[PDB]
Amino acid sequence: CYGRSMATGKLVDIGEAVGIVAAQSIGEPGTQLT
Amino acid sequence: EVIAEHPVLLNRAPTLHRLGIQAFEPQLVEGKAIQLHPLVCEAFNADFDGDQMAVHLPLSAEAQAEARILMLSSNNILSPASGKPLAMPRLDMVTGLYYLTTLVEGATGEYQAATKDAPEQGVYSSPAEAIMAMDRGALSVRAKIKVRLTELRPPTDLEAQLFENGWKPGDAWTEETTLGRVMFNELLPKSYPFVNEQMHKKVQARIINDLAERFPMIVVAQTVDKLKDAGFYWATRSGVTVSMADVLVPPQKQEILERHEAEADAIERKYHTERNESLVKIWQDATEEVGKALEEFYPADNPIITIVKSGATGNLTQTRTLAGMKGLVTNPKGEFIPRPIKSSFREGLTVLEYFINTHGARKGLADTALRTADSGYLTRRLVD
Amino acid sequence: WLSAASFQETTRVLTDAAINCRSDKLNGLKENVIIGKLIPAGTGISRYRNINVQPTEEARAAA
Amino acid sequence: IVKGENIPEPGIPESFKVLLKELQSLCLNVEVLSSDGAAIEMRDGD
Amino acid sequence: MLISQRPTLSEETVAENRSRFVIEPLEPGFGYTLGNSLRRTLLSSIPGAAVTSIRIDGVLHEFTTVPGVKEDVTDIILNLKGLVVSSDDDEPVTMYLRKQGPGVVTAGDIVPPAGVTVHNPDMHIATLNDKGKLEVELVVERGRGYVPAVQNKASGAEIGRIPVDSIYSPVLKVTYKVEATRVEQRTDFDKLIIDVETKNSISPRDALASAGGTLVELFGLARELNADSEHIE
Amino acid sequence: LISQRPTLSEETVAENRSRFVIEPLEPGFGYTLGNSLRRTLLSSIPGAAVTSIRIDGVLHEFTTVPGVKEDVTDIILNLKGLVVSSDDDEPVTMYLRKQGPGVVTAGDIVPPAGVTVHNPDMHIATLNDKGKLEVELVVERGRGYVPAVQNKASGAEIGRIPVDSIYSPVLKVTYKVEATRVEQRTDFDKLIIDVETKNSISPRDALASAGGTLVELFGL
Amino acid sequence: SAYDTPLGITNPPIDELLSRASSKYALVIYAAKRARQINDYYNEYVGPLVEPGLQEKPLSIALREIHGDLLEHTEG
Amino acid sequence: GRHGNKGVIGKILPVEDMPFLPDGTPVDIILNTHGVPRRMNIGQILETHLGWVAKAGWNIDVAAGVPDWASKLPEELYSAPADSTVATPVFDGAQEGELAGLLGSTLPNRDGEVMVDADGKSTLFDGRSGEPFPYPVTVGYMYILK
Amino acid sequence: LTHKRRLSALGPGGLSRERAGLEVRDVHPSHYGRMCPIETPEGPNIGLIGSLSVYARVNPFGFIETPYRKVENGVVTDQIDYLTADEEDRHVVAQANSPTDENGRFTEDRVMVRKKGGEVEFVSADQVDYMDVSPRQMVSVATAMIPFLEHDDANRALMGANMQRQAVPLVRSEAPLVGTGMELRAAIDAGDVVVADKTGVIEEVSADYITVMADDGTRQSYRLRKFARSNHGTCANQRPIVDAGQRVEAGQVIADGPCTQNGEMALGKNLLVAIMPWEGHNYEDAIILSNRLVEEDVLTSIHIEEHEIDARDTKLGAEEITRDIPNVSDEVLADLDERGIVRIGAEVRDGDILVGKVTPKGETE
RNA sequence: UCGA
């Protein structure tokens, strides 16, 4: 259901914790917002 | 002896994403400083202006294994958010490669068709012969000559016409490309088809994105490694150097100034919120006109344009303030100021223009300190 | 309840948990981080960490 | 490391024991219990 | 004076045409000092024979191609450039290549005059279409380095003469690089990796020895001034 | 091939520096050959420099000597400009003693047997009626640049003051190439080199030291 | 076949090691637990499978064992 | 520097292999070109050109009528010896027209040859490779702080 | 010097750093000639800390005053008045930079000015009263020391001014080849240099002190600080610039300070710089140096450090400082005198014993 | 209180 692992370019492994990855994916660019 | 194949973890605070921590193989180096790979800088967001980094040493076998497989630098070349390659040639490597792939009209050794008693004479036998012609003053890297290639791979569609049975494992062929585009295609793996393009950071992102998907990770690690060596090598030869002479001023501004300032001076007769807006809307076009006229004035070979036009660094708006005019600058409140900055950093700013410039410059610098604080609070809520 | 205690409003989270006599199953990873356990993710999943490794008899014969 | 042996299995961070004792000072009865049976003691008290 | 220790030279062979050589250790930063001089010496300093011009029968004012062969004039030009031939003449020697009818021409089809020899008889010069004829005259002369196409007006006056870019030195390709090796407590001593690809005229080992011989004799004129003291072997 | 044995003919401009020219050379050989000698000149020419110094009144470098205008650090920064030449491999010590008012120069040092000072005009220190300067310096043999060798790693005692030792006779070296001729006509690349010494040795001795240096290095 | 003979810590490549196990995490416990065994051999007890280096970290030995299909593992 | 340019020392090359003028005089610091345009501090280039202008002596021909570039020119500054100190007050400084005209000046490097053109760029020689760099580069004397 | 002229809003009777809003940090139009808008910290303290301007001075009530040249009827006057805020708005301020005829007056028909807004305005000589004494009235000492300041953005200018106070005294400090004339004045007013207060002739010169013989007969002497440890660890060493038989004048420099050359502020060196990318070794702000700077010490600096320990009466006895350290190899104490301290002039390394001491213990067990 |  999730999808392809963005870093791997392949399917998501059974161990990936995507909540923290998504939180960092949204939070890191937050310095560029106005 | 103990350092051998014993990984270490490097950290650069603040750590925004997981790529802020990466594993490396240590190399004993003299001095008290740390040597960091130039490609991983985009991940750490680490400037070389004096940044400090931390090192941690894994101990148990499980820890060492997680550093070699999971956290190795070569293993993660892609941003685990958007998917775009995070470690790719940037800055010097961009302009370094953008210089090689470019083809200059009428360069030295340019190939021309055969006419009457003169054969073609422009082509070369092998790429190794092109080097012999380059060392001597005959051949130029940016020339339009065509060569016969054996080991390199031709484009797919053009490959099937030259060869019906298969690819060119050891079989020769010919095409018309600049020598810089031939040497660039030597860095890529043999299986990849010819590109024949001038390297832009957007295009180089399309190619690296294509290698990560098609080829193995190791092949991508070595290809990006070979790209940074050529990007740095030809960055020195790029002829890109800053001087007061290369930066220049377009004349059209004074006319636009004559036009705007005087046609806005005619607006002063009517003189309220729209009056200033009428001058702002008018002065807003003067900045665009100067930048548009500046882009037309500057030749392509000049270094400042080659930068930011190849995607290495910078933007056109920054060059709009350097030469021409910096334009209107906001006041303490969100309201624009009708009086623009007519001077350019090249021509120098008047005493008064500097005072009103710090109004917006400091307010934006105070915003930088605040935005990083609220984003960190937002990130902790997302994680939890 | 200790994951919310470590997050925000520690005082309010604690009084509510103690009044309800709450019990924390120590499921999430933030709990395992605080107690020094293996987080239930990545290599810490109940499957990976229990992997058994043995050399194949065919390969052991070579030695 | 000095003996060349393997790294042993980790224990409980000391700050966590301090955390339990701090909670007990607030008059909050805290117990770490096994899945089966009843609670256990990190030390003299828990 | 000077005293140094343990410069060495080793040989790793990639193929018959190219091999790798290493020198360890070099006192910093001698690796970069003499590296580019070796590359320059191997490329342009070694004598060899090549073809300075050719003349194919039947082609005079033609822009390109030729009747009776699938090879265009250009492809044959660079097909003939890859001809590895060593001559003892030191003066221009004229050769001749002739054939007719259906077939494919090789390097062994040409009759080499006494004193010159072709080392690649299996090389592909061209292919002759059915009911076609091909005759070509060649000019082979010795030289050093790489001299491009030359217009001397003697080639320009002759209606047919076609000068070709001459590849003289048998060494085709040479690259180098330096690294850092710790000989003792002193760190970052220089090593020199040099790669050389040549052709059957001479081997890479003999090309290196010849290149080193011309260099030592090239710096010999400066040493003759005093001979006070120099870095030890 | 064309047969011309490349011949080198020396020139002179001043006593410290003298030009040199080599002809003929194949095209493109002037740049790399002139640099191969330049780098060797700027590096391996031996010295002929001073290692450590010793002064009776000072136990370290950060104190001032009474009656003199400079300090020990500033005096050592002035002593770095010394150009000395020694024929002895083993170390030797010179001596300098100057009392009363005046200006101590580089000629006031009494050199041992076999050593000399090539710039007596160098300014060291200026003293007055109360000023007295007694200093001995150790001249050694070497090449290139070596930093100060600390006495803790050596066997020296507290008094000896290590100093950065620079062994090099050569000062400024450059070159230029004239391919000349024309596009055709077997254009010969010839290089005209400019070598300058500090008076420790003549430009011929240096170019011979550099020339003979790589002669033994090249091998196969 | 585009390796260019990788040098250290990257050898063997991860891709050829990933075909030998479920995921990258399964590969970690795979090689890690074997490194525990090899170091126990020098003091489960079953030698090295591949000819070891002069002095080779037990983990690097275990990775080369997995590379040649010399080991078996079962997930829990 | 004094303009806000900052950076650590990535390496120190021996004096033998370093970009050097035809003088044989090696340079001292090598600054990355990519950092100048983006940071919006161009004054460092100005003091780098002026730094070279003041280092070597400079003499204005002036002829009979004087160059118009000097109409608002500096007073009695036309001449100046080698290694001269110059002062550029903040908002009463050396302007752009004067800098270009000041680049034309005396450059006797031990001999008659001048080492910097009117555009402020010189042809450097790579000491490591032994061949000159393909394009002219900007050289000069800047003021840096530890 | 910059520290002494600093203006900070935080403190007792003032706002806290978190309590301070963004309204104070923005430069006010009343900061012209009073507080320097460029110079300030880049950390959490932006806008709160500032540097007092050059020509400004404080009132008895505490309101900053700025000098101005009164101009009446379109003719600049020799009169100068110090105006402060409210009084500055009641007048229009001419631009310091304006055309000036030989005899003196407003040469151009239309002239610049700044009104009570403050808002810039283009008026005629009729309505002008006050005029700036000169440019740089606003920028402070550190800011005024940057050549070509008008060509740099306020951001990098703020970094350049802040990093100037972050420099370090070198062994031989040489004045800037190209630089504004502020280095001369700012150097003698910092107090770290030596100034002659009476015209006369130098009687004696030495590294320890210098003596001057005034023309009135008196004899003054000045002791030179020699390798004194600065509060932050730098060296304050001073050197005499005068010859024994020379002649000085009131206010003339005598001995240079930690960072000075012949009476001007020398914060660094003049280096030959070629601007080009060099084989990746200078990448993204990195810099490469010539080894000459190491051999010639041009960038070398001296750093002094102070260590301290005390012998205190303890509960179980008295602490004794001596060479009697209980457990050590006699080889490690070789550099100590009888008292047990380290010997002057001796070398050391991390782990060495600077001062031996002892404390009683019990019970041993 | 300063450095990124």
Swiss-Prot record, chain B:
It comes from Mycolicibacterium smegmatis (strain ATCC 700084 / mc(2)155). The lineage of its organism: Bacteria, Bacillati, Actinomycetota, Actinomycetes, Mycobacteriales. DNA-dependent RNA polymerase catalyzes the transcription of DNA into RNA using the four ribonucleoside triphosphates as substrates. The chain holds residues 489 to 878 of 1317 of the full protein. It comes from the Bacteria. The RNAP catalytic core consists of 2 alpha, 1 beta, 1 beta' and 1 omega subunit. When a sigma factor is associated with the core the holoenzyme is formed, which can initiate transcription. This is DNA-directed RNA polymerase subunit beta'. Mg(2+) binds at D47, D49, D51. Belongs to the RNA polymerase beta' chain family. Coiled coil: none annotated.
Curated annotation (Swiss-Prot), chain C:
Signal peptide: none annotated. DNA-dependent RNA polymerase catalyzes the transcription of DNA into RNA using the four ribonucleoside triphosphates as substrates. The RNAP catalytic core consists of 2 alpha, 1 beta, 1 beta' and 1 omega subunit. When a sigma factor is associated with the core the holoenzyme is formed, which can initiate transcription. Belongs to the RNA polymerase beta' chain family. This is DNA-directed RNA polymerase subunit beta'. It comes from Mycolicibacterium smegmatis (strain ATCC 700084 / mc(2)155). The lineage of its organism: Bacteria, Bacillati, Actinomycetota, Actinomycetes, Mycobacteriales.
UniProtKB/Swiss-Prot annotation, chain E:
GO terms for molecular function: DNA binding; DNA-directed RNA polymerase activity; protein dimerization activity. Its EC number is 2.7.7.6. It comes from the Bacteria. It catalyses: RNA(n) + a ribonucleoside 5'-triphosphate = RNA(n+1) + diphosphate. It is an enzyme of class 2 (transferase). Residues 1-226 are annotated as: Alpha N-terminal domain (alpha-NTD). Keywords: DNA-directed RNA polymerase, Nucleotidyltransferase, Transcription, Transferase. One of its GO terms (biological process) is DNA-templated transcription. One of its GO terms (cellular component) is DNA-directed RNA polymerase complex. DNA-dependent RNA polymerase catalyzes the transcription of DNA into RNA using the four ribonucleoside triphosphates as substrates. The N-terminal domain is essential for RNAP assembly and basal transcription, whereas the C-terminal domain is involved in interaction with transcriptional regulators and with upstream promoter elements. Homodimer. The RNAP catalytic core consists of 2 alpha, 1 beta, 1 beta' and 1 omega subunit. When a sigma factor is associated with the core the holoenzyme is formed, which can initiate transcription. Belongs to the RNA polymerase alpha chain family. This is DNA-directed RNA polymerase subunit alpha. It comes from Mycolicibacterium smegmatis (strain ATCC 700084 / mc(2)155) (Mycobacterium smegmatis). The gene is rpoA. The chain holds residues 1 to 233 of 350 of the full protein.
UniProtKB/Swiss-Prot annotation, chain I:
Changing H3 to D/L/P/R/Y: Rifampicin (Rif) resistant. Changing R6 to L/P: Rifampicin (Rif) resistant. Changing L10P: Rifampicin (Rif) resistant. Mutations in the RRDR sequence (residues 423-449) confer rifampicin (Rif) resistance. Rif blocks transcription initiation but not elongation. The RNAP catalytic core consists of 2 alpha, 1 beta, 1 beta' and 1 omega subunit. When a sigma factor is associated with the core the holoenzyme is formed, which can initiate transcription. Interacts with RbpA, which partially restores Rif-inhibited transcription. Belongs to the RNA polymerase beta chain family. DNA-dependent RNA polymerase catalyzes the transcription of DNA into RNA using the four ribonucleoside triphosphates as substrates. This subunit often mutates to generate rifampicin (Rif) resistance. Interaction with RbpA partially restores Rif-inhibited transcription; once the subunit is Rif-resistant however RbpA no longer stimulates transcription. This is DNA-directed RNA polymerase subunit beta. The gene is rpoB. The chain holds residues 440 to 804 of 1169 of the full protein.
